[PDB]
Design a protein around this ligand. Structure first.
Ligand SMILES: Nc1ncnc2c1ncn2[C@@H]1O[C@H](COP(=O)(O)OP(=O)(O)O)[C@@H](O)[C@H]1O
Ligand SMILES: O=C1NC(=O)[C@@H]2C[C@@H](c3ccccc3)CC[C@H]12
Ligand SMILES: [Mg+2]
Ligand SMILES: [Mg+2]
Length: 265
């Protein structure tokens, strides 16, 4: 069906490890979208064909306002192309670099949108496993959208592939290569809530080895300005034992969320 000839390419939207993402317009319809480009030599070297198939299969069947759409894909002997919904207000990562920290209303609103999208995902027993600011995009009304399903799977699961970059958003059971489930996403939600309020993630360190240590031991502290309600929620989510982490419904009904969020369940 689709081919590169069908699109006019425009400015670079971003770069990932494999992904090189461009603004693009479909020639016949003038439909504006995002084209994620992956090089076959790099995919083959890393041996990550299976993740790319998962990304397409999982994310193309999901339908939720707070999850980025994937429309299709094609390939052409040097490259693979994913056709994505364009997110015009960019990444949460960029927004955090701009403002340094988010206030409580902004934070509680993003956490609600995130928990809604995750609740929908978990109801199909899909776990995302790579929730972090560079993979959270913003729609035309500033609404949050989860993207980048390259690491997603069905629960329960072990890990069959190497952790490339940052450990900062992963739970103890994942970094120790143990069996894991849906609760991995709830831990990441806690890490994000902290980073939104404070400006950096709670286990951040100078080396991989010590970040690993802070995570496995759950060693984090709060700055004075973080309020009691925020502390209660973050402490509940960052539990070493997965079964002690709350359900997404309990997150959405937490008093601090309901007091500060501007969006409903
Ligand atoms: N649909 C989109 N709209 C706008 N920007 C995007 C979109 N998809 C990706 N980006 C930008 O490109 C970056 C890499 O995309 P991603 O799909 O996360 O690649 P990777 O799998 O390599 O991490 C994102 O962090 C973001 O900056
Ligand atoms: O040559 C390929 N390496 C890959 O990783 C791709 C897997 C294939 C594929 C099929 C469906 C969805 C996503 C990717 C297409 C062919 C290339
Ligand atoms: Mg990414
Ligand atoms: Mg990826």
């Amino acid at each position: 069906q689709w081919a590169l000839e069908d699109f006019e390419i425009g400015r670079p939207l971003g770069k990932g490890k494999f992904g090189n993402v461009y603004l693009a317009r479909e020639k016949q319809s003038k439909f504006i979208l995002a084209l994620k480009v992956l090089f076959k030599a790099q995919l083959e070297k890393a041996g990550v064909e299976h993740q790319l198939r998962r990304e397409v299969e999982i994310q193309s069947h999901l339908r939720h306002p707070n999850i980025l759409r994937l429309y299709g894909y094609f390939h052409d002997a040097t490259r693979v192309y994913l056709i994505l919904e364009y997110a015009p207000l960019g990444t949460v990562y960029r927004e955090l670099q701009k403002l340094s920290k988010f206030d409580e209303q902004r934070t509680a609103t993003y956490i609600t949108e995130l928990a809604n999208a995750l609740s929908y995902c978990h109801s199909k027993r899909v776990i995302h496993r790579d929730i972090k600011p560079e993979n959270l995009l913003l729609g035309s009304a500033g609404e949050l959208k989860i993207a980048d399903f390259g690491w997603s799977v069905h629960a329960p699961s072990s890990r069959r592939t190497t952790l490339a970059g940052t450990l900062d958003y992963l739970p103890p059971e994942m970094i120790e290569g143990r069996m894991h489930d849906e609760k991995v996403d709830l831990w990441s939600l806690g890490v994000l809530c902290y980073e939104f309020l404070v400006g950096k993630p709670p286990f951040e360190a100078n080396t991989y080895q010590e970040t690993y240590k802070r995570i496995s031991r759950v060693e984090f502290t709060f700055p004075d300005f973080v309020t009691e309600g925020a502390r209660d929620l973050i402490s509940r989510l960052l539990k070493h034992n997965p079964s002690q982490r709350p359900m997404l419904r309990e997150v959405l009904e937490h008093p601090w969320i309901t007091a500060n969020s501007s969006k409903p369940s």
